[PDB]
């Protein structure tokens, strides 16, 4: 395993991961993406926030995780009318524009941070359902605290799960991304198998739609035995292992899960650093801490502890002076010529990225390395 040299370093990084996340949590409950990055600062994402919240929940700060769930819940209850209006529009056969849909960026006071025309995404609503159910399960909490917000997210996802949207990386609005479908699946299966939610009017519908997502991924999201980045594609994306653990399109032991871990490792993993996708020119297409953590998590879940440890150590070696984890590092770049213009425009890469720290805490936890 680890000598006390490593255990010591990994424990201290976990404590710092907790402190970074909780210190930068907004007064209202939102977890920001990155407090100091020009392009992300002042905004919260349900995707970043939900993995961040799961990290914090595993670590055991019930107060912080709860305040984040309270924030999301209240933001969604305020969208009850917008979501009812969208559904009624569908019922009249008037397919609403991407511009009228629920946002991707939120302000800390729960307003659209951006025009959904430019960044329409559905994965975050699915991740939040997964996050809040998993938190309530872990800590014996009453989901009625967050139920009215869960109802908004479920109603929204049951109507719009099969709609093309931008991927986690804000690309290709015309496609249906297997890690977006995966995130929605994980959320629907979480609420649909939750005994506290057995009487919800949407209970059985969540499992029927989760089955329709799995049908669509079987038909168009599997090539040469592995998942693909979007329906009708041959290529992989670094997010795909999330479709095994924790979103559960397939379990860890499934041959598609094995083939997907192997395809991601072969195509996108360089010396423990996982790239997003082959064409990625964002800061030259560097190695993403959260993707190394995600692949590590999935190797742990599949019984490959060694594989998991190698990725955790890789992540730990990217911690800076203060123990802050960046979004990505440039040790290997897919398109090195593109880096300078990004640094020039937006500054040095987001550091800390709270999602980097949340994924650190999850992988540490999967390996039994949180401080005791
Ligand atoms: N696990």
mmCIF file with all atom_site columns, N, CA and C in Angstrom, residues 84-156:
data_model
loop_
_atom_site.group_PDB
_atom_site.id
_atom_site.type_symbol
_atom_site.label_atom_id
_atom_site.label_alt_id
_atom_site.label_comp_id
_atom_site.label_asym_id
_atom_site.label_entity_id
_atom_site.label_seq_id
_atom_site.pdbx_PDB_ins_code
_atom_site.Cartn_x
_atom_site.Cartn_y
_atom_site.Cartn_z
_atom_site.occupancy
_atom_site.B_iso_or_equiv
_atom_site.pdbx_formal_charge
_atom_site.auth_seq_id
_atom_site.auth_comp_id
_atom_site.auth_asym_id
_atom_site.auth_atom_id
_atom_site.pdbx_PDB_model_num
ATOM 1   N N  . UNK A 1 84  ? -43.272 24.106 -15.086 1.00 0.00 ? 84  UNK A N  1
ATOM 2   C CA . UNK A 1 84  ? -44.695 23.804 -15.401 1.00 0.00 ? 84  UNK A CA 1
ATOM 3   C C  . UNK A 1 84  ? -45.026 24.386 -16.794 1.00 0.00 ? 84  UNK A C  1
ATOM 4   N N  . UNK A 1 85  ? -44.602 25.616 -17.071 1.00 0.00 ? 85  UNK A N  1
ATOM 5   C CA . UNK A 1 85  ? -44.765 26.346 -18.359 1.00 0.00 ? 85  UNK A CA 1
ATOM 6   C C  . UNK A 1 85  ? -44.127 25.559 -19.504 1.00 0.00 ? 85  UNK A C  1
ATOM 7   N N  . UNK A 1 86  ? -42.897 25.078 -19.342 1.00 0.00 ? 86  UNK A N  1
ATOM 8   C CA . UNK A 1 86  ? -42.238 24.208 -20.347 1.00 0.00 ? 86  UNK A CA 1
ATOM 9   C C  . UNK A 1 86  ? -43.070 22.954 -20.604 1.00 0.00 ? 86  UNK A C  1
ATOM 10  N N  . UNK A 1 87  ? -43.471 22.242 -19.565 1.00 0.00 ? 87  UNK A N  1
ATOM 11  C CA . UNK A 1 87  ? -44.222 20.981 -19.729 1.00 0.00 ? 87  UNK A CA 1
ATOM 12  C C  . UNK A 1 87  ? -45.547 21.266 -20.465 1.00 0.00 ? 87  UNK A C  1
ATOM 13  N N  . UNK A 1 88  ? -46.238 22.347 -20.128 1.00 0.00 ? 88  UNK A N  1
ATOM 14  C CA . UNK A 1 88  ? -47.547 22.690 -20.720 1.00 0.00 ? 88  UNK A CA 1
ATOM 15  C C  . UNK A 1 88  ? -47.314 22.994 -22.200 1.00 0.00 ? 88  UNK A C  1
ATOM 16  N N  . UNK A 1 89  ? -46.175 23.602 -22.530 1.00 0.00 ? 89  UNK A N  1
ATOM 17  C CA . UNK A 1 89  ? -45.793 23.934 -23.917 1.00 0.00 ? 89  UNK A CA 1
ATOM 18  C C  . UNK A 1 89  ? -45.609 22.635 -24.696 1.00 0.00 ? 89  UNK A C  1
ATOM 19  N N  . UNK A 1 90  ? -44.893 21.678 -24.125 1.00 0.00 ? 90  UNK A N  1
ATOM 20  C CA . UNK A 1 90  ? -44.755 20.320 -24.721 1.00 0.00 ? 90  UNK A CA 1
ATOM 21  C C  . UNK A 1 90  ? -46.168 19.758 -24.928 1.00 0.00 ? 90  UNK A C  1
ATOM 22  N N  . UNK A 1 91  ? -47.040 19.801 -23.916 1.00 0.00 ? 91  UNK A N  1
ATOM 23  C CA . UNK A 1 91  ? -48.413 19.221 -23.992 1.00 0.00 ? 91  UNK A CA 1
ATOM 24  C C  . UNK A 1 91  ? -49.214 19.847 -25.145 1.00 0.00 ? 91  UNK A C  1
ATOM 25  N N  . UNK A 1 92  ? -49.050 21.126 -25.470 1.00 0.00 ? 92  UNK A N  1
ATOM 26  C CA . UNK A 1 92  ? -49.661 21.752 -26.682 1.00 0.00 ? 92  UNK A CA 1
ATOM 27  C C  . UNK A 1 92  ? -48.903 21.418 -27.983 1.00 0.00 ? 92  UNK A C  1
ATOM 28  N N  . UNK A 1 93  ? -47.905 20.528 -27.950 1.00 0.00 ? 93  UNK A N  1
ATOM 29  C CA . UNK A 1 93  ? -46.985 20.231 -29.067 1.00 0.00 ? 93  UNK A CA 1
ATOM 30  C C  . UNK A 1 93  ? -46.078 21.388 -29.476 1.00 0.00 ? 93  UNK A C  1
ATOM 31  N N  . UNK A 1 94  ? -45.732 22.354 -28.614 1.00 0.00 ? 94  UNK A N  1
ATOM 32  C CA . UNK A 1 94  ? -44.793 23.449 -28.989 1.00 0.00 ? 94  UNK A CA 1
ATOM 33  C C  . UNK A 1 94  ? -43.422 23.304 -28.311 1.00 0.00 ? 94  UNK A C  1
ATOM 34  N N  . UNK A 1 95  ? -42.647 22.287 -28.711 1.00 0.00 ? 95  UNK A N  1
ATOM 35  C CA . UNK A 1 95  ? -41.225 22.014 -28.307 1.00 0.00 ? 95  UNK A CA 1
ATOM 36  C C  . UNK A 1 95  ? -40.486 23.317 -27.979 1.00 0.00 ? 95  UNK A C  1
ATOM 37  N N  . UNK A 1 96  ? -40.301 23.658 -26.691 1.00 0.00 ? 96  UNK A N  1
ATOM 38  C CA . UNK A 1 96  ? -39.614 24.893 -26.316 1.00 0.00 ? 96  UNK A CA 1
ATOM 39  C C  . UNK A 1 96  ? -38.165 24.978 -26.802 1.00 0.00 ? 96  UNK A C  1
ATOM 40  N N  . UNK A 1 97  ? -37.733 26.174 -27.180 1.00 0.00 ? 97  UNK A N  1
ATOM 41  C CA . UNK A 1 97  ? -36.344 26.454 -27.608 1.00 0.00 ? 97  UNK A CA 1
ATOM 42  C C  . UNK A 1 97  ? -35.375 26.147 -26.471 1.00 0.00 ? 97  UNK A C  1
ATOM 43  N N  . UNK A 1 98  ? -34.139 25.828 -26.802 1.00 0.00 ? 98  UNK A N  1
ATOM 44  C CA . UNK A 1 98  ? -33.047 25.739 -25.808 1.00 0.00 ? 98  UNK A CA 1
ATOM 45  C C  . UNK A 1 98  ? -32.977 27.036 -24.998 1.00 0.00 ? 98  UNK A C  1
ATOM 46  N N  . UNK A 1 99  ? -33.281 28.186 -25.609 1.00 0.00 ? 99  UNK A N  1
ATOM 47  C CA . UNK A 1 99  ? -33.152 29.475 -24.904 1.00 0.00 ? 99  UNK A CA 1
ATOM 48  C C  . UNK A 1 99  ? -34.117 29.575 -23.713 1.00 0.00 ? 99  UNK A C  1
ATOM 49  N N  . UNK A 1 100 ? -35.218 28.816 -23.642 1.00 0.00 ? 100 UNK A N  1
ATOM 50  C CA . UNK A 1 100 ? -36.213 28.869 -22.542 1.00 0.00 ? 100 UNK A CA 1
ATOM 51  C C  . UNK A 1 100 ? -35.982 27.832 -21.446 1.00 0.00 ? 100 UNK A C  1
ATOM 52  N N  . UNK A 1 101 ? -34.957 27.006 -21.583 1.00 0.00 ? 101 UNK A N  1
ATOM 53  C CA . UNK A 1 101 ? -34.742 25.842 -20.690 1.00 0.00 ? 101 UNK A CA 1
ATOM 54  C C  . UNK A 1 101 ? -34.069 26.321 -19.396 1.00 0.00 ? 101 UNK A C  1
ATOM 55  N N  . UNK A 1 102 ? -33.918 25.438 -18.413 1.00 0.00 ? 102 UNK A N  1
ATOM 56  C CA . UNK A 1 102 ? -33.263 25.750 -17.120 1.00 0.00 ? 102 UNK A CA 1
ATOM 57  C C  . UNK A 1 102 ? -31.780 25.964 -17.391 1.00 0.00 ? 102 UNK A C  1
ATOM 58  N N  . UNK A 1 103 ? -31.125 26.841 -16.609 1.00 0.00 ? 103 UNK A N  1
ATOM 59  C CA . UNK A 1 103 ? -29.757 27.244 -16.926 1.00 0.00 ? 103 UNK A CA 1
ATOM 60  C C  . UNK A 1 103 ? -28.682 26.231 -16.538 1.00 0.00 ? 103 UNK A C  1
ATOM 61  N N  . UNK A 1 104 ? -27.465 26.505 -16.997 1.00 0.00 ? 104 UNK A N  1
ATOM 62  C CA . UNK A 1 104 ? -26.250 25.750 -16.618 1.00 0.00 ? 104 UNK A CA 1
ATOM 63  C C  . UNK A 1 104 ? -25.535 26.521 -15.496 1.00 0.00 ? 104 UNK A C  1
ATOM 64  N N  . UNK A 1 105 ? -25.184 27.788 -15.722 1.00 0.00 ? 105 UNK A N  1
ATOM 65  C CA . UNK A 1 105 ? -24.556 28.643 -14.685 1.00 0.00 ? 105 UNK A CA 1
ATOM 66  C C  . UNK A 1 105 ? -25.656 29.250 -13.831 1.00 0.00 ? 105 UNK A C  1
ATOM 67  N N  . UNK A 1 106 ? -25.498 29.169 -12.514 1.00 0.00 ? 106 UNK A N  1
ATOM 68  C CA . UNK A 1 106 ? -26.321 29.916 -11.551 1.00 0.00 ? 106 UNK A CA 1
ATOM 69  C C  . UNK A 1 106 ? -25.455 30.977 -10.885 1.00 0.00 ? 106 UNK A C  1
ATOM 70  N N  . UNK A 1 107 ? -26.048 32.130 -10.643 1.00 0.00 ? 107 UNK A N  1
ATOM 71  C CA . UNK A 1 107 ? -25.535 33.078 -9.649  1.00 0.00 ? 107 UNK A CA 1
ATOM 72  C C  . UNK A 1 107 ? -25.809 32.483 -8.260  1.00 0.00 ? 107 UNK A C  1
ATOM 73  N N  . UNK A 1 108 ? -25.091 32.977 -7.260  1.00 0.00 ? 108 UNK A N  1
ATOM 74  C CA . UNK A 1 108 ? -25.192 32.468 -5.874  1.00 0.00 ? 108 UNK A CA 1
ATOM 75  C C  . UNK A 1 108 ? -26.592 32.772 -5.341  1.00 0.00 ? 108 UNK A C  1
ATOM 76  N N  . UNK A 1 109 ? -27.304 33.745 -5.911  1.00 0.00 ? 109 UNK A N  1
ATOM 77  C CA . UNK A 1 109 ? -28.707 34.047 -5.525  1.00 0.00 ? 109 UNK A CA 1
ATOM 78  C C  . UNK A 1 109 ? -29.702 33.311 -6.457  1.00 0.00 ? 109 UNK A C  1
ATOM 79  N N  . UNK A 1 110 ? -29.234 32.355 -7.252  1.00 0.00 ? 110 UNK A N  1
ATOM 80  C CA . UNK A 1 110 ? -30.056 31.356 -7.984  1.00 0.00 ? 110 UNK A CA 1
ATOM 81  C C  . UNK A 1 110 ? -30.637 31.835 -9.301  1.00 0.00 ? 110 UNK A C  1
ATOM 82  N N  . UNK A 1 111 ? -30.099 32.921 -9.870  1.00 0.00 ? 111 UNK A N  1
ATOM 83  C CA . UNK A 1 111 ? -30.528 33.459 -11.191 1.00 0.00 ? 111 UNK A CA 1
ATOM 84  C C  . UNK A 1 111 ? -29.705 32.807 -12.288 1.00 0.00 ? 111 UNK A C  1
ATOM 85  N N  . UNK A 1 112 ? -30.184 32.850 -13.534 1.00 0.00 ? 112 UNK A N  1
ATOM 86  C CA . UNK A 1 112 ? -29.417 32.339 -14.686 1.00 0.00 ? 112 UNK A CA 1
ATOM 87  C C  . UNK A 1 112 ? -28.090 33.106 -14.681 1.00 0.00 ? 112 UNK A C  1
ATOM 88  N N  . UNK A 1 113 ? -26.974 32.416 -14.703 1.00 0.00 ? 113 UNK A N  1
ATOM 89  C CA . UNK A 1 113 ? -25.648 33.042 -14.868 1.00 0.00 ? 113 UNK A CA 1
ATOM 90  C C  . UNK A 1 113 ? -25.324 33.260 -16.330 1.00 0.00 ? 113 UNK A C  1
ATOM 91  N N  . UNK A 1 114 ? -26.100 32.647 -17.222 1.00 0.00 ? 114 UNK A N  1
ATOM 92  C CA . UNK A 1 114 ? -25.859 32.642 -18.688 1.00 0.00 ? 114 UNK A CA 1
ATOM 93  C C  . UNK A 1 114 ? -27.173 32.325 -19.395 1.00 0.00 ? 114 UNK A C  1
ATOM 94  N N  . UNK A 1 115 ? -27.198 32.590 -20.689 1.00 0.00 ? 115 UNK A N  1
ATOM 95  C CA . UNK A 1 115 ? -28.307 32.293 -21.618 1.00 0.00 ? 115 UNK A CA 1
ATOM 96  C C  . UNK A 1 115 ? -28.188 30.832 -22.036 1.00 0.00 ? 115 UNK A C  1
ATOM 97  N N  . UNK A 1 116 ? -29.186 30.000 -21.678 1.00 0.00 ? 116 UNK A N  1
ATOM 98  C CA . UNK A 1 116 ? -29.110 28.578 -22.006 1.00 0.00 ? 116 UNK A CA 1
ATOM 99  C C  . UNK A 1 116 ? -28.964 28.312 -23.509 1.00 0.00 ? 116 UNK A C  1
ATOM 100 N N  . UNK A 1 117 ? -29.288 29.257 -24.417 1.00 0.00 ? 117 UNK A N  1
ATOM 101 C CA . UNK A 1 117 ? -29.000 29.078 -25.867 1.00 0.00 ? 117 UNK A CA 1
ATOM 102 C C  . UNK A 1 117 ? -27.539 28.657 -26.043 1.00 0.00 ? 117 UNK A C  1
ATOM 103 N N  . UNK A 1 118 ? -26.621 29.305 -25.332 1.00 0.00 ? 118 UNK A N  1
ATOM 104 C CA . UNK A 1 118 ? -25.166 29.110 -25.525 1.00 0.00 ? 118 UNK A CA 1
ATOM 105 C C  . UNK A 1 118 ? -24.632 27.948 -24.688 1.00 0.00 ? 118 UNK A C  1
ATOM 106 N N  . UNK A 1 119 ? -25.333 27.467 -23.654 1.00 0.00 ? 119 UNK A N  1
ATOM 107 C CA . UNK A 1 119 ? -24.741 26.411 -22.784 1.00 0.00 ? 119 UNK A CA 1
ATOM 108 C C  . UNK A 1 119 ? -25.750 25.395 -22.229 1.00 0.00 ? 119 UNK A C  1
ATOM 109 N N  . UNK A 1 120 ? -26.939 25.282 -22.825 1.00 0.00 ? 120 UNK A N  1
ATOM 110 C CA . UNK A 1 120 ? -27.970 24.277 -22.457 1.00 0.00 ? 120 UNK A CA 1
ATOM 111 C C  . UNK A 1 120 ? -27.341 22.908 -22.167 1.00 0.00 ? 120 UNK A C  1
ATOM 112 N N  . UNK A 1 121 ? -27.597 22.423 -20.960 1.00 0.00 ? 121 UNK A N  1
ATOM 113 C CA . UNK A 1 121 ? -27.087 21.145 -20.399 1.00 0.00 ? 121 UNK A CA 1
ATOM 114 C C  . UNK A 1 121 ? -28.141 20.599 -19.443 1.00 0.00 ? 121 UNK A C  1
ATOM 115 N N  . UNK A 1 122 ? -28.355 19.296 -19.426 1.00 0.00 ? 122 UNK A N  1
ATOM 116 C CA . UNK A 1 122 ? -29.329 18.660 -18.510 1.00 0.00 ? 122 UNK A CA 1
ATOM 117 C C  . UNK A 1 122 ? -28.623 17.794 -17.459 1.00 0.00 ? 122 UNK A C  1
ATOM 118 N N  . UNK A 1 123 ? -27.319 17.538 -17.575 1.00 0.00 ? 123 UNK A N  1
ATOM 119 C CA . UNK A 1 123 ? -26.634 16.514 -16.720 1.00 0.00 ? 123 UNK A CA 1
ATOM 120 C C  . UNK A 1 123 ? -26.702 16.928 -15.247 1.00 0.00 ? 123 UNK A C  1
ATOM 121 N N  . UNK A 1 124 ? -26.577 18.213 -14.958 1.00 0.00 ? 124 UNK A N  1
ATOM 122 C CA . UNK A 1 124 ? -26.462 18.757 -13.598 1.00 0.00 ? 124 UNK A CA 1
ATOM 123 C C  . UNK A 1 124 ? -27.681 18.438 -12.746 1.00 0.00 ? 124 UNK A C  1
ATOM 124 N N  . UNK A 1 125 ? -28.876 18.483 -13.320 1.00 0.00 ? 125 UNK A N  1
ATOM 125 C CA . UNK A 1 125 ? -30.133 18.166 -12.599 1.00 0.00 ? 125 UNK A CA 1
ATOM 126 C C  . UNK A 1 125 ? -30.082 16.682 -12.212 1.00 0.00 ? 125 UNK A C  1
ATOM 127 N N  . UNK A 1 126 ? -29.558 15.830 -13.094 1.00 0.00 ? 126 UNK A N  1
ATOM 128 C CA . UNK A 1 126 ? -29.458 14.388 -12.829 1.00 0.00 ? 126 UNK A CA 1
ATOM 129 C C  . UNK A 1 126 ? -28.425 14.115 -11.749 1.00 0.00 ? 126 UNK A C  1
ATOM 130 N N  . UNK A 1 127 ? -27.274 14.787 -11.829 1.00 0.00 ? 127 UNK A N  1
ATOM 131 C CA . UNK A 1 127 ? -26.234 14.668 -10.788 1.00 0.00 ? 127 UNK A CA 1
ATOM 132 C C  . UNK A 1 127 ? -26.782 15.112 -9.430  1.00 0.00 ? 127 UNK A C  1
ATOM 133 N N  . UNK A 1 128 ? -27.541 16.194 -9.366  1.00 0.00 ? 128 UNK A N  1
ATOM 134 C CA . UNK A 1 128 ? -28.030 16.670 -8.060  1.00 0.00 ? 128 UNK A CA 1
ATOM 135 C C  . UNK A 1 128 ? -28.960 15.620 -7.438  1.00 0.00 ? 128 UNK A C  1
ATOM 136 N N  . UNK A 1 129 ? -29.875 15.024 -8.205  1.00 0.00 ? 129 UNK A N  1
ATOM 137 C CA . UNK A 1 129 ? -30.787 13.993 -7.652  1.00 0.00 ? 129 UNK A CA 1
ATOM 138 C C  . UNK A 1 129 ? -29.922 12.872 -7.060  1.00 0.00 ? 129 UNK A C  1
ATOM 139 N N  . UNK A 1 130 ? -28.945 12.400 -7.824  1.00 0.00 ? 130 UNK A N  1
ATOM 140 C CA . UNK A 1 130 ? -27.997 11.357 -7.351  1.00 0.00 ? 130 UNK A CA 1
ATOM 141 C C  . UNK A 1 130 ? -27.341 11.805 -6.042  1.00 0.00 ? 130 UNK A C  1
ATOM 142 N N  . UNK A 1 131 ? -26.784 13.006 -6.031  1.00 0.00 ? 131 UNK A N  1
ATOM 143 C CA . UNK A 1 131 ? -26.052 13.591 -4.880  1.00 0.00 ? 131 UNK A CA 1
ATOM 144 C C  . UNK A 1 131 ? -26.944 13.625 -3.641  1.00 0.00 ? 131 UNK A C  1
ATOM 145 N N  . UNK A 1 132 ? -28.130 14.220 -3.750  1.00 0.00 ? 132 UNK A N  1
ATOM 146 C CA . UNK A 1 132 ? -28.958 14.452 -2.537  1.00 0.00 ? 132 UNK A CA 1
ATOM 147 C C  . UNK A 1 132 ? -29.467 13.107 -2.022  1.00 0.00 ? 132 UNK A C  1
ATOM 148 N N  . UNK A 1 133 ? -29.837 12.185 -2.891  1.00 0.00 ? 133 UNK A N  1
ATOM 149 C CA . UNK A 1 133 ? -30.338 10.865 -2.434  1.00 0.00 ? 133 UNK A CA 1
ATOM 150 C C  . UNK A 1 133 ? -29.192 10.149 -1.723  1.00 0.00 ? 133 UNK A C  1
ATOM 151 N N  . UNK A 1 134 ? -27.994 10.153 -2.303  1.00 0.00 ? 134 UNK A N  1
ATOM 152 C CA . UNK A 1 134 ? -26.827 9.413  -1.751  1.00 0.00 ? 134 UNK A CA 1
ATOM 153 C C  . UNK A 1 134 ? -26.466 9.999  -0.367  1.00 0.00 ? 134 UNK A C  1
ATOM 154 N N  . UNK A 1 135 ? -26.542 11.320 -0.228  1.00 0.00 ? 135 UNK A N  1
ATOM 155 C CA . UNK A 1 135 ? -26.253 12.032 1.032   1.00 0.00 ? 135 UNK A CA 1
ATOM 156 C C  . UNK A 1 135 ? -27.269 11.628 2.094   1.00 0.00 ? 135 UNK A C  1
ATOM 157 N N  . UNK A 1 136 ? -28.553 11.665 1.760   1.00 0.00 ? 136 UNK A N  1
ATOM 158 C CA . UNK A 1 136 ? -29.626 11.361 2.721   1.00 0.00 ? 136 UNK A CA 1
ATOM 159 C C  . UNK A 1 136 ? -29.488 9.906  3.169   1.00 0.00 ? 136 UNK A C  1
ATOM 160 N N  . UNK A 1 137 ? -29.204 9.009  2.235   1.00 0.00 ? 137 UNK A N  1
ATOM 161 C CA . UNK A 1 137 ? -28.986 7.584  2.542   1.00 0.00 ? 137 UNK A CA 1
ATOM 162 C C  . UNK A 1 137 ? -27.817 7.455  3.513   1.00 0.00 ? 137 UNK A C  1
ATOM 163 N N  . UNK A 1 138 ? -26.668 8.022  3.170   1.00 0.00 ? 138 UNK A N  1
ATOM 164 C CA . UNK A 1 138 ? -25.422 7.879  3.958   1.00 0.00 ? 138 UNK A CA 1
ATOM 165 C C  . UNK A 1 138 ? -25.681 8.321  5.402   1.00 0.00 ? 138 UNK A C  1
ATOM 166 N N  . UNK A 1 139 ? -26.448 9.391  5.638   1.00 0.00 ? 139 UNK A N  1
ATOM 167 C CA . UNK A 1 139 ? -26.506 10.072 6.958   1.00 0.00 ? 139 UNK A CA 1
ATOM 168 C C  . UNK A 1 139 ? -27.883 9.950  7.603   1.00 0.00 ? 139 UNK A C  1
ATOM 169 N N  . UNK A 1 140 ? -28.736 9.059  7.108   1.00 0.00 ? 140 UNK A N  1
ATOM 170 C CA . UNK A 1 140 ? -30.084 8.835  7.668   1.00 0.00 ? 140 UNK A CA 1
ATOM 171 C C  . UNK A 1 140 ? -30.957 10.080 7.686   1.00 0.00 ? 140 UNK A C  1
ATOM 172 N N  . UNK A 1 141 ? -30.958 10.879 6.620   1.00 0.00 ? 141 UNK A N  1
ATOM 173 C CA . UNK A 1 141 ? -31.688 12.173 6.609   1.00 0.00 ? 141 UNK A CA 1
ATOM 174 C C  . UNK A 1 141 ? -33.048 11.992 5.933   1.00 0.00 ? 141 UNK A C  1
ATOM 175 N N  . UNK A 1 142 ? -33.982 12.879 6.248   1.00 0.00 ? 142 UNK A N  1
ATOM 176 C CA . UNK A 1 142 ? -35.354 12.919 5.700   1.00 0.00 ? 142 UNK A CA 1
ATOM 177 C C  . UNK A 1 142 ? -35.336 13.717 4.385   1.00 0.00 ? 142 UNK A C  1
ATOM 178 N N  . UNK A 1 143 ? -35.614 13.066 3.244   1.00 0.00 ? 143 UNK A N  1
ATOM 179 C CA . UNK A 1 143 ? -35.560 13.707 1.912   1.00 0.00 ? 143 UNK A CA 1
ATOM 180 C C  . UNK A 1 143 ? -36.703 14.711 1.768   1.00 0.00 ? 143 UNK A C  1
ATOM 181 N N  . UNK A 1 144 ? -37.699 14.694 2.661   1.00 0.00 ? 144 UNK A N  1
ATOM 182 C CA . UNK A 1 144 ? -38.793 15.698 2.621   1.00 0.00 ? 144 UNK A CA 1
ATOM 183 C C  . UNK A 1 144 ? -38.206 17.113 2.745   1.00 0.00 ? 144 UNK A C  1
ATOM 184 N N  . UNK A 1 145 ? -37.041 17.253 3.345   1.00 0.00 ? 145 UNK A N  1
ATOM 185 C CA . UNK A 1 145 ? -36.370 18.564 3.462   1.00 0.00 ? 145 UNK A CA 1
ATOM 186 C C  . UNK A 1 145 ? -36.141 19.164 2.059   1.00 0.00 ? 145 UNK A C  1
ATOM 187 N N  . UNK A 1 146 ? -35.896 18.320 1.063   1.00 0.00 ? 146 UNK A N  1
ATOM 188 C CA . UNK A 1 146 ? -35.476 18.770 -0.288  1.00 0.00 ? 146 UNK A CA 1
ATOM 189 C C  . UNK A 1 146 ? -36.478 18.292 -1.347  1.00 0.00 ? 146 UNK A C  1
ATOM 190 N N  . UNK A 1 147 ? -37.642 17.785 -0.941  1.00 0.00 ? 147 UNK A N  1
ATOM 191 C CA . UNK A 1 147 ? -38.526 17.003 -1.855  1.00 0.00 ? 147 UNK A CA 1
ATOM 192 C C  . UNK A 1 147 ? -39.100 17.934 -2.937  1.00 0.00 ? 147 UNK A C  1
ATOM 193 N N  . UNK A 1 148 ? -39.571 19.133 -2.596  1.00 0.00 ? 148 UNK A N  1
ATOM 194 C CA . UNK A 1 148 ? -40.231 20.028 -3.568  1.00 0.00 ? 148 UNK A CA 1
ATOM 195 C C  . UNK A 1 148 ? -39.225 20.392 -4.677  1.00 0.00 ? 148 UNK A C  1
ATOM 196 N N  . UNK A 1 149 ? -37.940 20.406 -4.371  1.00 0.00 ? 149 UNK A N  1
ATOM 197 C CA . UNK A 1 149 ? -36.904 20.705 -5.366  1.00 0.00 ? 149 UNK A CA 1
ATOM 198 C C  . UNK A 1 149 ? -36.601 19.470 -6.180  1.00 0.00 ? 149 UNK A C  1
ATOM 199 N N  . UNK A 1 150 ? -36.561 18.319 -5.524  1.00 0.00 ? 150 UNK A N  1
ATOM 200 C CA . UNK A 1 150 ? -36.476 17.018 -6.225  1.00 0.00 ? 150 UNK A CA 1
ATOM 201 C C  . UNK A 1 150 ? -37.609 16.889 -7.258  1.00 0.00 ? 150 UNK A C  1
ATOM 202 N N  . UNK A 1 151 ? -38.833 17.242 -6.891  1.00 0.00 ? 151 UNK A N  1
ATOM 203 C CA . UNK A 1 151 ? -40.031 17.180 -7.772  1.00 0.00 ? 151 UNK A CA 1
ATOM 204 C C  . UNK A 1 151 ? -39.814 18.046 -9.008  1.00 0.00 ? 151 UNK A C  1
ATOM 205 N N  . UNK A 1 152 ? -39.268 19.245 -8.832  1.00 0.00 ? 152 UNK A N  1
ATOM 206 C CA . UNK A 1 152 ? -38.990 20.102 -10.006 1.00 0.00 ? 152 UNK A CA 1
ATOM 207 C C  . UNK A 1 152 ? -37.993 19.386 -10.919 1.00 0.00 ? 152 UNK A C  1
ATOM 208 N N  . UNK A 1 153 ? -36.863 18.907 -10.388 1.00 0.00 ? 153 UNK A N  1
ATOM 209 C CA . UNK A 1 153 ? -35.794 18.278 -11.193 1.00 0.00 ? 153 UNK A CA 1
ATOM 210 C C  . UNK A 1 153 ? -36.315 17.009 -11.903 1.00 0.00 ? 153 UNK A C  1
ATOM 211 N N  . UNK A 1 154 ? -37.072 16.171 -11.211 1.00 0.00 ? 154 UNK A N  1
ATOM 212 C CA . UNK A 1 154 ? -37.632 14.932 -11.816 1.00 0.00 ? 154 UNK A CA 1
ATOM 213 C C  . UNK A 1 154 ? -38.592 15.302 -12.960 1.00 0.00 ? 154 UNK A C  1
ATOM 214 N N  . UNK A 1 155 ? -39.541 16.205 -12.717 1.00 0.00 ? 155 UNK A N  1
ATOM 215 C CA . UNK A 1 155 ? -40.504 16.619 -13.743 1.00 0.00 ? 155 UNK A CA 1
ATOM 216 C C  . UNK A 1 155 ? -39.744 17.083 -14.979 1.00 0.00 ? 155 UNK A C  1
ATOM 217 N N  . UNK A 1 156 ? -38.734 17.952 -14.800 1.00 0.00 ? 156 UNK A N  1
ATOM 218 C CA . UNK A 1 156 ? -37.877 18.478 -15.876 1.00 0.00 ? 156 UNK A CA 1
ATOM 219 C C  . UNK A 1 156 ? -37.180 17.342 -16.610 1.00 0.00 ? 156 UNK A C  1
#
